[PDB]
Design a protein around this ligand. Structure first.
Ligand SMILES: CCOc1ccc(NC(C)=O)cc1Cl
Lengths: 9, 245
């Protein structure tokens, strides 16, 4: 998900 | 079992995280209070199409959400949580933190909010076709401004809006419980130092923030019905991910 990517995951 | 020194340090850390991820400097916000949209400019906004007004507002909300993700990333203990819980917390709370943060940009003297360069009242948002939602948002900000929050108090309160151990779907629940409790200690410690603990009984009941987020999701369902292609083509993908049903 985009949230994951934004968190640096 | 956090010491008083560790709690004091937590206050400072949270306040720093917040100041660093503030979209707008409070001084800039103040130095623009009399900079208000004219009759003509207000008419310009009211005359805009529903799709245009929604697209602009979706962009601004997404920008605000990006800053909240950054706040989370800098917040003591948050990045120590597992990947699942970081996501669960942000999904449930990012919009709530934005709604609280808005009171920084809300002038209660004339019920206006800083939006696209000037202060506009809620009549600026007519073309959205969701007046009860918009007015509920304005009332929430107004009720918050009656508490006269300092930057520090907002920092601590928003940390708590985000770190909620009762969000469905958490996997390290005790870990989130511990962080929420220490943040509560930090908040209550800071309040007592300023004899401001009386504000606690005057904080919004959690149902209020929940009803606001729920209204937004519902109004988006209606918009998406009317303009299905606009959402896919023009809305930020994060917005779509977080709010589309
Ligand atoms: C009715 C809620 O709408 C808004 C009010 C204010 C702002 N301001 C900024 C700076 O984003 C954005 C939106 Cl979408």
């Amino acid at each position: 998900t985009l949230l994951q990517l934004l968190l640096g995951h | 079992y956090a010491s008083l020194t560790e709690i004091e340090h937590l206050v400072q850390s949270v306040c720093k995280s917040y100041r660093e991820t503030c979209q707008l400097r409070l001084e800039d916000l103040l130095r623009q209070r009399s900079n208000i949209f004219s009759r003509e400019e207000v008419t310009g906004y009211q005359r805009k199409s529903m799709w245009e007004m929604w697209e602009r507002c979706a962009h601004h909300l997404t920008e605000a959400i990006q800053y909240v993700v950054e706040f989370a990333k800098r917040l003591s203990g948050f990045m120590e949580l597992c990947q699942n819980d970081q996501i669960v917390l942000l999904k449930a709370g990012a919009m709530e933190v934005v709604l609280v943060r808005m009171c920084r940009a809300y002038n209660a003297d004339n019920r206006t909010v800083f939006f696209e360069g000037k202060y506009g009242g809620m009549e600026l948002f007519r073309a959205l076709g969701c007046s009860e939602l918009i007015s509920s948002i304005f009332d929430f900000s107004h009720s918050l401004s009656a508490l006269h929050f300092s930057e520090d108090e907002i920092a601590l309160y928003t940390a708590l809006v985000l770190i909620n151990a009762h969000r469905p779907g958490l996997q390290e629940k005790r870990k989130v419980e511990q962080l929420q409790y220490n943040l509560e200690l930090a908040f209550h410690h800071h309040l007592s130092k300023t004899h401001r603990q009386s504000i606690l009984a005057k904080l919004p009941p959690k149902g209020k923030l929940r009803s606001l987020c729920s209204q937004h999701v519902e109004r988006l369902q209606i918009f998406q019905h009317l303009h299905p292609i606009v959402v896919q083509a023009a809305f930020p993908p994060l917005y779509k991910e977080l709010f589309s049903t």
